């Protein structure tokens, strides 16, 4: 029934097995310092996973998982403090970034927005402190701004914390183009260092914002219109920043963020030059037949429980029963209007969100742009990264 084909029915070997996840995929991702271990070091993680494997800890959602990481993170923070005392700012920055990645993996896959005392929430708070300390030592530092949510209605929160990083020389005399990153289910505002490096290297500002039902996003997760109000507040803030050119602005949605990049490409088409949706869902990812097997594929742990919470559902049963008709950009008719240029990037063999969620968008509204990677799973990494920048260069060309 799916382009994924027979692999749809494959039970992936790492399912319910942190040992297999580590030994077959994550050890190598960590070794290579690529997602989700970007900015990280194997020396920090090998001892932690050896501990988790020896204790037969498999449930990432358990406190036994999260607490295994915390002493290592603390040790790196103290090493950074010692480095900083000796005036070794580069070493201190690198150590704090390493602590941030340890916190990041400790809170994989999802900070429960309904559990403010959860150890994963504690880990995320410590990650943000360590990350801001690390990036304060950068020549072009990442600054946090709490954007007042002027467009808030109903159950929306009051505050939108975003990261902003501006290139050397960014001035009101010649305002710079903006790339706004919309983060995902397991990646939040501190998880995008290399993207900010690449954006700044091309003379652009990087802005990072979390999506509804995640991290510190104030958007009502249960209101499908809540992201529209969120981007109204964020874009209106960026409009008033003298050194940022909102006339040359592209949105970049990562994984769960892809949905929001697609949506904003339609809802905010007159305020964006372009959108990139990286491994996006928009319709078929919420199909009950797809949700029936989504936990058996390449995502490191069970995803449906996290998805239920992120979509504002009190139970997984309600999510599976109701989500598609409520949130599908196809079912709700969001796709039946024009959009700014929209680049769709994914692996054809995505088992997290179906490649059909890219393909369906060519049958609605404006022409879409796409590159889909044969035989590759969710996000199509590493192949899908370089083309992102080639496209951004074309769209933001002077």
Numbering used by the authors: 3 to 400
Sentences from the paper on this structure:
In summary, the N‐ and C‐domains in all three enzymes are oriented in a back‐to‐back fashion forming an interface that encloses the intramolecular binding cavity next to the active site. The catalytic triad is formed exclusively by the α/β‐hydrolase domain with the nucleophilic serine located in the consensus GXSXG esterase motif.
For example, in Aspergillus fumigatus (Af), the type I PKS AfPksP produces the naphthopyrone heptaketide YWA1, whose acetoacetyl side chain is removed by the serine hydrolase Afyg1p. Single‐wavelength anomalous diffraction (SAD) was performed to obtain experimental phases for Afyg1p, which was used as a model for Patterson search calculations of the Wdyg1p structure. Both enzymes consist of an N‐domain and a C‐domain connected with a short linker. The N‐domains exhibit an α‐helix bundle, whereas the C‐domains adopt a classical α/β‐hydrolase topology. Consistent with the more extended polar substrate, the acetoacetyl binding site in Afyg1p is less hydrophobic, and the chamber formed by Ala258, Tyr287, Ile305, Trp309, and Val355 is increased in size (800 Å3). Taken together, the specificity pocket of Afyg1p is entirely occupied by the product, whereas in Afyg1papo, each position matching the hydroxyl groups 1─OH, 6─OH, and 8─OH of THN and 1─OH of 1,3‐DHN (analogous to 3─OH in THN) is filled by a water molecule.
